[PDB]
Design a protein around this ligand. Structure first.
Ligand SMILES: [Mg+2]
Ligand SMILES: [Mg+2]
Ligand SMILES: [Mg+2]
Ligand SMILES: [Mg+2]
Ligand SMILES: [Mg+2]
Lengths: 201, 138, 109, 175, 190
RNA sequence: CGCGGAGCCUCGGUUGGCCUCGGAUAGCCGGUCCCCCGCGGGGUCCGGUGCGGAGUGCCCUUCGUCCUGGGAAACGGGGCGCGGCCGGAGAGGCGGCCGCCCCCUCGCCCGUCACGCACGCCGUUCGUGGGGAACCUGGCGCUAAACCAUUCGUAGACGACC
RNA sequence: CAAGCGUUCAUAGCGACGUCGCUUUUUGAUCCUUCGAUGUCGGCUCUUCCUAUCAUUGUGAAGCAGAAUUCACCAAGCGUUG
RNA sequence: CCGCGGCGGUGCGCCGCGACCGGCUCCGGGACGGCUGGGAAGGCCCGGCGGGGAAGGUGGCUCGGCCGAGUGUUACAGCCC
């Protein structure tokens, strides 16, 4: 498709998603992954913690401030995984990463946009229901976030707000349906021509 | 809790594969992914057919569990699936997809128009309902 | 007054892994994800279109700033509804992950 | 041997006649393979173990499909088997509940792959035989086996996870 | 091998009224109300008996290791029913050679306060969980009574004080002192 | 800030979509007669949808111009039309909602005529008052600090800093 | 694996005759790199890593009563001197 | 000079079209042979001969409004195999 993408990270699989993101970043499409705390990983909680802590020990001995940067926020963690699936030594790879953009929680502009979901990276689909897991949120915490608590309380504040809109939008649809029935004999030979070639049945 | 109990005789619509978009009586279950399947009046031979390529309907019928064509010819024929299907909500939103793909550029120009004025005659009433909802609030 | 030029991205030029072959480009047309799907896009003209700095002539027009390498879709490219297209000049790599504009006007309906 | 989906390339063959013995015996094996050219080759592997018989000293008389007498009717295929494990070489009763002898072993060859990492070139079929209702031992099979037999297809994933490669709607899996 | 079906009916008494929100069972009888979620185990919980007579847990396309769990859900439900009808009572009798283990409950249940286990100056404190009413008994000498509706909660809490009271760097063959569970039962027996 | 006239250059694009939460061996919506809470929220009952039709397989809006002279539709839209009160802060940047002036009468059917009919041909159409860099009009505001030199040392190689 | 010791008792602790491995802090083989020559032994100082845990934290063992002691686990956090 | 008549060479620069042919890569159709003179199936029936699951059955038990639903057993056919 065209235009800016917004993907809602919750319920996705950390790398399975990131491969799909990274393909479309390289095709010039602007992606914005949101809510990366929610993003989740196969294998049990600890497994991947233990696997992260393995990362943290990897560190340039003779000076570490050069050595690998083990970013702690889920946004950043995922970025990393996307980035490893780009050719980021090269100009198109860095130009690619710039087309990506990644947040923890869901911010201004992106609260206020409908937003999509990659079923082929989606956990309920890709995984078996009898298998264990981490949320990159909790993983990120036990590795050195400072901001699981904050991005909780803000998202609760956003959810409460978004619910108002959902309910007002719910109330307009109830008006649409009641107003179809309150005018169904001066649109009763247009609605006809809709339902004849499929539209609206 | 489920409501569709893959019996001897759940009518199943074949989602896809060689016989896509046809109804099929599950005669009998072979295995944990394969049935012995047959769609007499929908034109589908008694053959094996997997549960992955078929979705299933609220309808049942009552041949017994290795009945032989003539007997599933009936039980389909009365009970009458091919009329009861077509009064369903499946059949009418299938046979709508159908009719969009099957739509000439002319048809589409008409709809463009027919919609527009529908969507105005619907809108002016919604505006008027909020006027009455605001005067009710007063 | 709209598309005509139907939307497509230029993905890479046809390549092995430690080689690449710059005649044939690989064209990712929008709304076409199968090799069954794509038999329309065969034969169609396409255009990587730009502007660049100096003015250049324009048939049915005054000299504009726009230029085009001007090509043609040869055949499909693997299961997923990618397409191979070879333009008259080779494509300039700058274009990787940009538009090209696959038309209708050598239609075969 | 490899596979595809197997077929009953049944075969008979004599040990070609010498001056001393002019009418040597003939023998149908239910060689049981993917085409002719191997199912030919596979009796002679097999006969050369049993008889003192060989590709030089023989002839195939008849090779041809035996093709199912009851392929719309579900059936309880047993199979006095023999294989070669990494350790030794081992006999098996096994049951597949397909509706067609060949497809029934087509299963078996795919399970011996999976349940034992046994490749076809190691396996030997002693003999398949369809079995009645009773005289089935394997509870796996011994359940499909009833009249009022009953399923739902509980946690049905979507495939077509790339038609809409993305969407707004999250999927569903209760149906 | 996957087993086509396994199931089990729990026989619910006339006192109690279970009402399952999808998978989440809530149980209310005389004593109180309990709740628990089986939003893991993945089974089909039907309430088939009209008036209200049966919980039936299904399991359905299940291999061996989930077939196990049919019966475990079936249990935490009986175990709830017994809890909200009768209610449980774990008794735990303190044990010693010498220094008298000196218990004193300190809000209602909640704080179980233990001076002098083995002459130790540090006064062990132990919280109970919510809904667990500890109390020092009578009709017996060195003996606590942990009352509650929830088995889970009542027996961590036994175990918390049973484990808070452990000796170190000794023979625990010899040093058989501490507080430990003597009798798992109920408040009302019927 | 507004609204004016030329011109280097750097490019990508070529309707929008203005929104719940999450479940997945379940959900969606309606309506409450009834009950509790703060027009709403929670509850209970019933009625609908649930290979989903207040379906991202989705919805919307239109796309050669105006004439004039019928029907269907009729107060819709506009003048960078103009003031006030909102609501929105996670890295807001946007909505929203009220007076008054002038102007216009547009969606769908139809008649009825018209618009350089360029004489089969290409970068056609817009987001475009793009981004940025140079210069011609009015009104209102503006009206330095930094570094050196000096001094001090709280600091010192010089540099740095108080 | 296991015949034994361990009052008794295989296996608390041990453990023969056998047998399967690692490891490269021992020496050998080897001669692949260097002979337009890479400074050839020790000591001092100074970092860092490993665990093949001597201490200490938390633990499971004992033929652990205490005291004292060895067997083992996570464990390399800080110790290892004149 | 006007013919751009007929012949021979080209194209200033950007282009587009057509029909033969070679090689390819595809896509629609339609007809036949064989075979255990193919297995299988269908329909029509008919007249027979047998066996198993299992009944428009019967029966023990359950759940619901005699009927409907569940389980349990002998097995004839008023189902089917
Ligand atoms: Mg342009
Ligand atoms: Mg001691
Ligand atoms: Mg001895
Ligand atoms: Mg040197
Ligand atoms: Mg160790």
């Amino acid at each position: 498709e065209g235009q800016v993408l917004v993907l809602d990270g919750r319920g996705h699989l950390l790398g399975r998603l990131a491969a799909i993101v990274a393909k479309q970043v390289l095709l010039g499409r602007k992606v914005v992954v949101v809510r990366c705390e929610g993003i989740n990983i196969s294998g049990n909680f600890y497994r991947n913690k233990l696997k992260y802590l393995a990362f943290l020990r990897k560190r340039m001995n003779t000076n570490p401030s050069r050595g690998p940067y083990h970013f702690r926020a889920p946004s950043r963690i995922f970025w990393r995984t996307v980035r490893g699936m780009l050719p980021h030594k090269t100009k198109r790879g860095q130009a690619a990463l710039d087309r990506l953009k990644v947040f923890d929680g869901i911010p201004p502009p992106y609260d206020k946009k409908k937003r999509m979901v990659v079923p082929a990276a989606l956990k309920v689909v890709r995984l078996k229901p009898t298998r264990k897991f981490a949320y990159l949120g909790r993983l990120a915490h036990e590795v050195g976030w400072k901001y699981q608590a904050v991005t909780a309380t803000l998202e609760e504040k956003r959810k409460e707000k978004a619910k108002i809109h959902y309910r007002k939008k719910k109330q307009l649809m109830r008006l649409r349906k009641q107003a179809e029935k309150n005018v169904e004999k001066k649109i009763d030979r247009f609605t006809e021509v809709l339902k004849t070639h499929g539209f609206l049945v | 809790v489920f409501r569709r109990f893959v019996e001897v005789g759940r009518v199943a619509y074949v989602s896809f594969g060689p016989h896509a978009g046809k109804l099929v009586a599950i005669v009998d279950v072979i295995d944990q992914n394969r049935a012995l399947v047959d769609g007499p009046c929908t034109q589908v031979r008694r053959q094996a057919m997997p549960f992955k390529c078929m979705q299933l309907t609220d309808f049942i019928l009552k041949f017994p569990h290795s009945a032989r064509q003539k007997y599933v010819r009936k039980a389909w024929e009365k009970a009458d699936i091919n009329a009861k299907w077509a009064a369903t909500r499946w059949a009418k939103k299938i046979e709508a997809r159908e009719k969009k793909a099957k739509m000439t550029d002319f048809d589409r120009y008409k709809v463009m128009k027919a919609r527009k004025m529908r969507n105005r005659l619907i809108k002016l009433e919604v505006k008027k309902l909020q006027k009455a909802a605001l005067l009710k609030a007063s | 007054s709209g598309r005509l030029w139907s939307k497509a991205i230029f993905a890479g030029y046809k390549r092995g892994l430690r080689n690449q072959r710059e005649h044939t480009a690989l064209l990712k047309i929008e709304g076409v994800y199968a090799r069954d799907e794509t038999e329309f896009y065969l034969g169609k003209r396409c255009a990587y279109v730009y502007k660049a700095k100096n003015n250049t002539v324009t048939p049915g027009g005054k000299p504009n700033k726009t230029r085009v390498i001007w090509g043609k879709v040869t055949r499909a490219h693997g299961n997923s509804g990618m397409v191979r297209a070879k333009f008259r000049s080779n494509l300039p790599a700058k274009a990787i992950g940009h538009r090209i504009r696959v038309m209708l006007y050598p239609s075969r309906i | 041997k490899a596979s595809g989906t197997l077929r009953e390339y049944k075969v008979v063959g004599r040990c070609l006649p010498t001056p001393k013995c002019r009418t040597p015996p003939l023998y149908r094996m239910r060689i049981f393979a993917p085409n002719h050219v191997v199912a030919k080759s596979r009796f002679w592997y097999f006969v050369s173990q049993l008889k003192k018989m060989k590709k030089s000293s023989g002839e195939i008389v008849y090779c041809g499909q035996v093709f199912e007498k009851s392929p719309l009717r579900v059936k309880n295929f047993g199979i006095w088997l023999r294989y070669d494990s990494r350790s030794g070489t081992h006999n098996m009763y096994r049951e597949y509940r397909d509706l067609t002898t060949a497809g029934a072993v087509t299963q078996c060859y795919r399970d011996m792959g999976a349940r034992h990492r046994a490749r076809a070139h190691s396996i030997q079929i002693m003999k398949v035989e369809e079995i009645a209702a009773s005289k089935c031992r394997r509870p796996a099979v011994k359940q499909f086996h009833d009249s009022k037999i009953k399923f739902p297809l509980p946690h049905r994933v979507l495939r077509r996870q790339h038609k809409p490669r993305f969407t707004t709607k999250r999927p569903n899996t209760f149906f | 091998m996957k087993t086509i079906l396994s199931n089990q009916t729990v026989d619910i008494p006339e006192n109690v009224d279970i009402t399952l929100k999808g998978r989440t069972v809530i149980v209310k009888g005389p004593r109180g109300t309990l709740r628990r979620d089986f939003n893991h185990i993945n089974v089909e919980l039907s309430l088939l008996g009209k008036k209200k007579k049966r919980l039936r847990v299904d399991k359905w396309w299940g291999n061996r290791k989930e077939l196990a769990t049919v019966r475990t859900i079936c249990s935490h439900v009986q175990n709830m029913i017994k809890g909200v009808t009768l209610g449980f009572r774990y008794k735990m009798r303190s044990v010693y050679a010498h220094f008298p283990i000196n218990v004193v409950i300190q809000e209602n249940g909640s704080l179980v306060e233990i001076r002098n286990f083995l002459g130790e100056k540090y006064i062990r404190r132990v919280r109970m969980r919510p809904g667990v009413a500890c109390s020092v008994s009578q009709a017996q000498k060195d003996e606590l009574i942990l009352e509650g509706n929830d088995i889970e909660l009542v027996s961590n809490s036994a175990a918390l004080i049973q484990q808070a009271t452990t000796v170190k760097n000794k023979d625990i063959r010899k040093f058989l002192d501490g507080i430990y569970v003597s009798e798992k039962g109920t408040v009302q027996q019927a």
